Amino acid sequence: GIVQDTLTAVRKFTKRDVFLERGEVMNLLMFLSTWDGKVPQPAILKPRPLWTGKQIFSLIIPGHINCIRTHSTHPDDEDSGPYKHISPGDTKVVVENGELIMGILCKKSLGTSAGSLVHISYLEMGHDITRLFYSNIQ
Amino acid sequence: RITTPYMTKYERARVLGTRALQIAMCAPVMVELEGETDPLLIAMKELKARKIPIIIRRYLPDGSYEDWGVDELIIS
Amino acid sequence: AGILFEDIFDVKDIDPEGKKFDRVSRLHCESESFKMDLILDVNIQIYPVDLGDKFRLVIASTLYEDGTLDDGEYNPTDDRPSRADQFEYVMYGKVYRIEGDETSTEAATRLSAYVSYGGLLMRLQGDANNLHGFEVDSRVYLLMKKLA
Amino acid sequence: KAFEKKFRFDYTNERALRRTLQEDLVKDVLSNAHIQNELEREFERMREDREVLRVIFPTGDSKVVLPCNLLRMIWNAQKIFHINPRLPSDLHPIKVVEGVKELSKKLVIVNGDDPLSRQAQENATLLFNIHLRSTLCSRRMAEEFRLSGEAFDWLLGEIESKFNQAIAHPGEMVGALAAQSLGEPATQMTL
Amino acid sequence: MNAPPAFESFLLFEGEKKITINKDTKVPNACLFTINKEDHTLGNIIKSQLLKDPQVLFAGYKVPHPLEHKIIIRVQTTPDYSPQEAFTNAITDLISELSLLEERFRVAIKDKQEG
């Protein structure tokens, strides 16, 4: 169960602007059940240590899943032109090695569907692992 | 024996259920139980150790009684 | 050392496509003396950048300037090695792609190395002779500093 | 022509070869006529399977439903073994051919030793095998997936295991599954 | 019926210890203090004071369930410092700050009343 409550929120969490501070990050890591006790390195060391939404999410994502979805508002003239692996609007999702590299999540990426990172998690990682992935997202 | 060498999830459920019921009714544990005092947990340990003393009649649809030892069936 | 790359860039653009995000802006830079293109997402709230600034990019594989590798875990205390803190901006990312203009026959003369600092993407695109320290899935450090 | 340009394995360039295979393999692919004729056998197998697909799917819709995501296992392998796609591979094309040939014999739905059992087996896995031989190609695995010697062995073992897990489990209530899965879409239709 | 009496959000029952320490085994020098009959009042200040020690690498707290009245505070320090001392020093420095705040407020009052 991933209801609207934590789907809008995960689209806002994984936007490119979500920079979490140190106390906020530690607060969030208290609610990861599948956390290995290691604080990731910040995306931004100087001037201020400042994590990102995609870092804490890539901590949620289980195992070493690989996935490439495409966020809902992706311009279709992007894959052809330049910026195809850059994506100025952050609309192409690439979970590579269990780790959100780019792209905003939504239900297209987190529902159950063809692709649908949670589906690839159920297929690749297991069945209790995706239970934990659901509850951790929430 | 013309049958899937894997243990069906239905077979796994029924083996663990009956094994834990036996253990609850004083059947001797066949695994080095450490701190475990719950039938079902002991049944899972006994299964993962390949030591549950049970065999299965897989009844084919003609009537063949295919005998499989729970320690032979490839389990998850 | 550990410096995969280093140069002085000049910002020719800040948001050509128009600002998509409020705290993050996308510099389009061109270097000096290496004939190299850079595209870089920057947190312009904590580190403001505008047109025509000349900053000094350095891309390293470690911060310790003795060569010893990083282990990639937040350790804010240890200074047993002396960090490369001559820089104002320091991001930490992972090279996630290295394209090139190679054809089936020859090798690539120009390369494009794409890095993603926790989600803020950079694309460093130039000659294949100085973009050769990079390799996919390599964790890398970007250190910028404006020049006066 | 695109099908031939993409699945053929030229083996007649000596430049595109050294760009994508170690030198031992590139001299083994040209200094041999047994390797080249086996590669031609693979392409003919692939072309006639193409003609079979053109019969099964006469409308041309290539999106099928098969029990192993092969383009994702190839990716898991490229990640598990740190495959550098900028380097000549060490995977021998004949090894791809022979490996998928022996893999297709471990994916057994109908256990044979029996002419009608062998035919039911060849039918039960006719589409998945066409897929497997057109994605674990020898031209694609050497210029597109760039797998290595051991990445490929891991990939074969992985395909076989993830297939054997997909086989239907006896005693499964398939009638109840079908009923509920046809009825749950009846909750959003018209009228 | 199933209405918990209002006083059992702050009143220990027999055998509750008010605090227990578990060493966290996933990492070195990490402890996990479970404090019974506390809430964000006492959890958040201790967390924010631990995050002031330069030898604390992780400080966090959580209320597991809001209907149960207890918090968990996870601390992780540098090897030359134990999380028990980091916790103790946090509480001592909070007590010191509030003592200072109390006397400063008494003086500010007694000046506002134009004493």
Brief account:
The structure is cut from a larger assembly and holds 2 copies of chain A, 1 copy of chain B (about 80 residues), 1 copy of chain C (about 150 residues) and 1 copy of chain E (about 120 residues). Chain A has about 140 residues and is mainly alpha-helical.
What do these coordinates show?
It is classed as transcription. Keywords: rpap2, RNA Polymerase II, transcription. The entry is titled "Structure of RPAP2-bound RNA polymerase II". This is part of a larger assembly, with 2 copies of chain A, 1 copy of chain B (76 residues), 1 copy of chain C (148 residues) and 1 copy of chain E (115 residues). Chain A has 138 residues and is mainly alpha-helical. Chain A is 34% helix and 6% strand. Chain A has one domain (4-138): Enzyme I, Chain A, domain 2, CATH 1.10.274.100. Chain A has a two-stranded antiparallel ribbon. Chain A starts with a helix and ends with a helix. By secondary structure, chain B is an alpha+beta fold. Chain B contains 2 helices and 2 strands; from the N terminus they run ααββ. In chain B, strand 1 and strand 2 (66-69) form a beta hairpin. The longest helix of chain B is centred in the N-terminal third of the chain and has 16 residues, at 9-24. The two termini of chain B are 21 Å apart. Chain C is mainly beta. Chain C has one domain (5-148). In chain C, a hairpin with a 2-residue loop joins strand 6 (110-117) and strand 7 (120-127). Chain E has helices at residues 40-50, 83-112, and strands at residues 20-24, 30-36, 56-62, 70-77. The chains are: A mainly alpha (138), B alpha+beta (76), C mainly beta (148), E alpha+beta (115). Chains in contact: A-C, A-D, A-E, B-D, C-D, C-E. The interface between A and C is large, with 36 and 41 residues.
Structural descriptors:
part of a larger assembly; 5 chains; A: 138 residues; mainly alpha; Enzyme I, Chain A, domain 2; two-stranded antiparallel ribbon; 34% helix; C: 148 residues; mainly beta; eight-stranded antiparallel β-barrel; 8 strands; 45% strand; globular; RBP11-like (chain E); RNA_pol_Rpb11_13-16kDa_CS (chain E); DNA-directed RNA polymerase activity (chain E)
| Percent in helix of chain C | under 10%
Rg calc of chain A: 15 Å
Subunit arrangement of the protein: part of a larger assembly
Number of domains of chain C: 1
Say what the CATH topology of chain A is. Enzyme I, Chain A, domain 2
Supply the helix-strand structural class of chain A: mainly alpha
Strand order of the largest sheet of chain C: 1-2-3-7-6-5-8-4
**Shape of chain C, please?**
globular
State the end-to-end CA separation of chain C: 25 Å
Shape of chain A: globular
Helical segment count of chain A? 6
What is the radius of gyration of chain C? 15 Å
Largest sheet of chain A: 2 strands, antiparallel
Number of domains of chain A: 1
* Tally of alpha and pi helices of chain C: 0
- State the distance separating the first and last CA atoms of chain A: 9 Å
Task: State the helicity of chain A in percent bands.
Answer: 25-40%
Looking across the biggest beta sheet of chain A, what order are the strands in? 2-3
The biggest beta sheet of chain C, please? Answer: 8 strands, antiparallel, barrel
GO cellular component, one term (chain C): RNA polymerase III complex
GO molecular function, one term (chain C): DNA-directed RNA polymerase activity
Subcellular location (chain C): Nucleus
Family (chain C): Belongs to the eukaryotic RPB8 RNA polymerase subunit family.
